[PDB]
Amino acid sequence: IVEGSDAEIGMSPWQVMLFRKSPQELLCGASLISDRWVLTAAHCLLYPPWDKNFTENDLLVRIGKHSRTRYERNIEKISMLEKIYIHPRYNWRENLDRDIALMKLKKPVAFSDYIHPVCLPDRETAASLLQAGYKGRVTGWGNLKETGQPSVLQVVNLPIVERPVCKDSTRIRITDNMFCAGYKPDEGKRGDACEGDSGGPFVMKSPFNNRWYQMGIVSWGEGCDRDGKYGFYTHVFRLKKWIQKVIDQF
């Protein structure tokens, strides 16, 4: 996270860390949606261009963390994955359309003061909250600048941006399944995700029921916190059907 600030203890109980077995390293962020399902971006598990193609036996899911590097004894819980599911229509060759994946833990994790699931949105909550100018919040242990690592989970609040504005800032063809967020060069405030943050949750707190909903997944950006550029997120609600499907079926 670029231009963010230290998260408060227990601020994002749903935050997860995608940890590589060997070499032991931070791969991506993710989010806990139930006691046996973790939600992340697909490009975290598969991206041929960068010779990335991990399997269940390749990584660990660490939940309940605050510190990036420390093994937080008695607080965090490390899980093994039973099955990874990538969206059957993830366009990694072109624009990362449908950058989403589900991971099923081997054994349920127990909630605590530091481990708690985030809500998935329903049509209404998405209809009402996903509006340009409305701020969301992103979290992660990713790099603090495009080109170093924070000590503890970072957080930054960003506003959602007008679709036309997003389109005109990139050459990449954006789809309905994505939305971009960020500040404009004039607004005089900055902030953005960055390497190691991707796969993380972009949440919003419902002013109606006081709950937190994940409205997006950090998907892709062109650099980090660049003026006139914005971070793109996977439109979670737009792909909810596939989520339910995978969960119910499997």
Binding site: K21, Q24, E25, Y71
Partner: peptide
């Protein structure tokens, strides 16, 4: 820097 040693129970 680098990460800290995590219990072996988790690496098998």
């Amino acid at each position: 820097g680098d990460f800290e040693e995590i219990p072996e129970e988790y690496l098998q």
